Amino acid sequence: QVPVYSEQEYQLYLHDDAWTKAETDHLFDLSRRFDLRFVVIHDRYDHQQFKKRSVEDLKERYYHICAKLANVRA
Ligand SMILES: [Ca+2]
Structure with missing residues (x-):
């Protein structure tokens, strides 16, 4: 999830x-x-409003946030 x-x-x-x-x-x-x-x-990314992001850019952003949330919610 x-x-x-x-x-x-x-x-x-x-x-x-x-x-x-x-x-x-x-x-x-x-x-x-x-x-x-x-x-x-x-x-499906709104590459109009937002920058061209690599698949790798998207994954790194998502899992940085996952890791940060795991930490702060401890
Ligand atoms: Ca789902």
Whole structure:
């Protein structure tokens, strides 16, 4: 299952100089809807609003957040 971060969690812990919350939210939405199939997530990505991201860029962002949430929720 895809983790769900709170707004406060994002603000305190999940910022990245190269990602908006809007884009991160989009990644996590696609991750839910497409069952973590990163080829599909990559295909369906709103490359209009957001930068061209590699599949690898998307996975690294997702699992950085997973690791950070695991830690702060301990
Ligand atoms: Ca799902």
